[model samples]
Target: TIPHLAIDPFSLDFFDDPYPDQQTLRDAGPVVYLDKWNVYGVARYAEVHAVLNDPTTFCSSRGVGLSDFKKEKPWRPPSLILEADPPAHTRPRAVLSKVLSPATMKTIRDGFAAAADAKVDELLQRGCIDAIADLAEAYPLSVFPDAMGLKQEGREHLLPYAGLVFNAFGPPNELRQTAIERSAPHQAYVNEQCQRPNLAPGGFGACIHAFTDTGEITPDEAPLLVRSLLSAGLDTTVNGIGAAVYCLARFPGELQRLRSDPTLARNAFEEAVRFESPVQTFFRTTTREVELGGAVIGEGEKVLMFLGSANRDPRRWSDPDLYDITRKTSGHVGFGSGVHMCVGQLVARLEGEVMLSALARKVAAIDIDGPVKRRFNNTLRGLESLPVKLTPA
Candidate 1:
């Protein structure tokens, strides 16, 4: 029999400091039944990875969050790629892959790089600033929205809406309810920008629309695809930058090491992802009765895979708690693993690399200046405010 734990993983208590809960989930057993949510959780690396890869048996189509689409109405239409299963999931995935490919990223790399340098230069005047608001969120919001050719008026809603959307993935708790109450305008803005005329010529969203003309996807599907990018593209990088800066500030030795080898920028981002796991947990339903971790999960049982916990599982990573930029970081489920892994990760790396590497060149030391504030979401682990004092190189 699997261990049963009565824990509300979505509560503010758990969100404030999850490592202890993460340890409990991992130590309990491979498959811990959450009596509070009536769901099974896989917190170990091996089991989580296996579930991510074996999507056929452990399905995502019903819903990737707490709500089962089959049993209840979705808050919005399901994501073509993120929430869809294979076969149906194939086309959108292929289109999204091409849209965010290295080639697509190249089109905007120079612009994004230039933006990173200029923004960092502007913020360095303060010497002391909130890394989350001033640097992390500022950097991505500066480059990504323009790259997508979205209207600038309502751009502020992007991050909030994304936070709301990810929160709605959990049970219909206070978090989800709050998002629903306040999401109308932000949600409406995000939906409106996906239209053809709103996207700037030669931008990422414009290119996604081009696929519709080529018959890769329907005209109706184009906006949804663009919406997918908007929903996912910004938040991950914002949180990744937050995680990297948080890690580097706490581990000064690693910061100096990265400064020595500026090429470690990409490695720095990947390591932080593995260390912090910005997008923490997701649920998948079993297509049929299946055996896992010495326990049987019945048909349609929703299992929550704890990505953050898996990344830190000692059985898979040696000294997993430490943040080391040199770690191989190949097998960590930071952006997730297998088919449903985040497609926007390349852009995130490019964004993170440019910012961190530039900071390495221009700044000498980063130290925490004020109390750090964590942003609580049901699925994402990140900081809302990280005040840091910087020494210019």
Candidate 2:
């Protein structure tokens, strides 16, 4: 029989502190069964990587959640890219890949950097502020929508829509239920924003729509791809910045290292991504019967790959618990791996680079000033409130 455990990965307790359970799962076996969700979990880096790379066997098509789309209706129209297998996945991915590619991100770099500098200056002026609210959320909300060429009004729904999208990936828990109830209005707004006419010309959204002109994707498929970008873009980056600040606050030596060499800013953010692992878990369905970790998995079994656990796996990383900004983090699954690796990753890194670099240049120290609050989600790991004091350089 397979090793079995009764851990609730969706509970608030797990979200509050995930590392202990992550370690337990990794140590239990390469693959373990979660009786609570009737799903399999792959926590170590090697197995998770295998599952992610071999998309044919461990497929994303059945809905990357505890619920298999083959049996039940999805909460929303399934994402064309996130929830589709290769043939269907191909064209949309091609379009998004071009839209958010490193070359395109290069064009937006100066504007993003300017926004970062101004935001950092404002946060430093306040001296003490909620890093999540004052810096992390504020910075991304300001820049990302602008990059998408979204209208200024009604941009407030972005986070809520993101919350629903991520939360929907879990079972029908209270958190998922609440997000679903409030998601109607946010969903409508996001849908409106995704239309080609609603997006300003020459922005990322407009560019995605441009691919439609060439018949790369279809006229109908264009908005859906834009919706995918909207879903992927915001909350993850917000948490990434929050995770970086949180790591630096807890590990002052890392901050000192970052301060000592300002160029380490990008790696500092990468290291934080490895350390915190913002998008904690994703599910893939077994497309057919396959042998894995001494067990014969049948078709359609939901396998949850713990990205956070894989990033900190001792077998793959040295001093896995330590937060070292200078550490090499090339293979971490924080943004995932293989074909579905985050398309918005370059934009996210660019955002993190500018923000962290600005902080390194102007701020002396980031002191954890007061109470910190964890924002619990079915999928994401981030702070809701991180009160911190900035010492100016």
Candidate 3:
């Protein structure tokens, strides 16, 4: 029988460090209804994966949030890819997947590595820096815009846009309101950039346009797809890199381990994703009445999969709360799983390995000057500022 310790998932305290609550929920049952939002909670790694992969039973079309898309107004048109199921989801994902495949990504790996190195060197020159904002956030802010072929002017708007998009997934509370208010001013510019004429040649945005010209997707569908890339891509990587830095700082010996064996960078990135899931939770609507663990889930009901919580579930991992760089974290749901498993994950991994490896090579050791600050968003786990003292190699 399951325990009765399941707590409300929306409480601020739960948001701050939800592992304990997640353990309670997972222990309670695989699918427990959270009365606060009337959503089913899937807290274990195995169950979360099963739900995310089994879209036949757990649908994505109904908005991946607490609000049911069929019954509510989407803050924006659903992502042609992220919000779509097979058949509709297949083509756009296939088109972009081909473009961002590992082979194609190799062509840009060297350039990305060089970019990360240059940025790290520049940050090192500044003596002390908020590693999160200065280096973690700075690296992606510099690279992805160029990769997308977007111009530098007003490019700083990407992070805020992403924050709003993620936060809007939750209820319209103060956090959601703040994100909306902050994103209001940049909405027009974002819309303007989605047009074909605004996209520069030889970038991902331009490739999206090319796909449209080939009759793969409608011109109307192109912008929302690219917006999905822009909205989901940037801030997550920023936070991911920040999480990596924090991981290294907290595990002092791991930095040396990484520097001595650079190949560990890939593992380190994966471990960081496991340790501090950047994207946190996403919702799925039940397609039919289904049973998970032992609980009965009704059709059309919403299910919340806490990817962060799943990553730290004690049943699936030994000392799940501890950050160990060498753990075999292959099946972790950090990038999600099954069909909607992050299509752009390769891009993120490449960015993480290159940036972390480059930094590892340049710095002999890194230490914190003060406490790391957390940036709160309903859907993202990110550091607001991480002040650090770097010892250059």
Please give, for residues 295-383, the per-residue lDDT of candidate 2 as tens digits. Answer: 88999899999999999999999998999988988999998899899988899899999999998888889999899888999999999
Model 3 bad stretches (over 4 Å): 1-6
* C-alpha positional error of residue 139 in candidate 1 after TM-score superposition, expressed in Å: 0.4
User: Which of 1 and 3 is ahead in TM-score?
Assistant: 1
- TM agreement with the true structure for every prediction: 0.99, 0.99, 0.96
Clashes of each: 0, 0, 0
Tens digits of per-residue lDDT for model 3, 1-393: 433443766556777787777778877777777766767788888889889889878888888877888998887778888888887998888877866778868777888999999988998898688998888888998888888878878886788788888888886778887877777666777777888887788788888878876777888888877787788778889988989999998888989989888888988999999999988899999889888887777789988998998899887888888877788999899999988888888889999999888877998888899887877888888788899988898
lDDT of 1 at 334: 90
Question: Candidate 3 at 150: error in angstroms?
Answer: 0.7
Model 1: residues >4 Å from true position, as ranges?
none
Q: Score residue 390 of candidate 3 by CA lDDT.
A: 86
Model 1 earns a TM-score of: 0.99
CA lDDT of each candidate? Answer: 0.91, 0.91, 0.83
